């Protein structure tokens, strides 16, 4: 009936919506991984700046 096609329509709506939901989940997840790697290289930069600054200060 009209209820049947309405149900199938909201069904495929839910399907595409959860699909895009998981999709942006994955996208923002990759972005968070990239940002974590950024933080890691950032702490590497902090450590290297600290050691070279300390060497400069020692001399």
């Amino acid at each position: 009936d009209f209820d049947d096609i309405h149900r199938k329509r909201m069904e495929k709506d839910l399907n595409e919506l959860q699909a895009l939901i998981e999709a942006h989940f994955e996208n923002r997840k990759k972005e968070e991984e990239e940002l974590v790697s950024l933080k890691d290289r950032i702490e590497r930069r902090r450590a290297e700046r600290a050691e070279q600054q300390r060497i400069r200060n020692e001399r």
């Binding site: 209820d3 909201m10 709506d13 839910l14 919506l17 959860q18 895009l20 939901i21 942006h24």
Partner: protein, 55 residues
């Protein structure tokens, strides 16, 4: 977020449809039972008229 809202909307569409069907069925029951009881009253009056005719 994003998918959560859509899932809630689906759960609400089910809510509206189920509630509307329940209300409509309840109205149908009320109407049908009123029909039956009025028919039974008509039957009773016919029995009494038959009794008067028998007298």
């Amino acid at each position: 977020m994003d998918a959560i809202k859509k899932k809630m909307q689906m759960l609400k569409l089910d809510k509206e449809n189920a509630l509307d069907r329940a209300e409509q069925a309840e109205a149908d029951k009320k109407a049908a039972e009123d029909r039956s009881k009025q028919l039974e009253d008509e039957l009773v009056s016919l029995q009494k008229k038959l009794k008067g005719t028998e007298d």
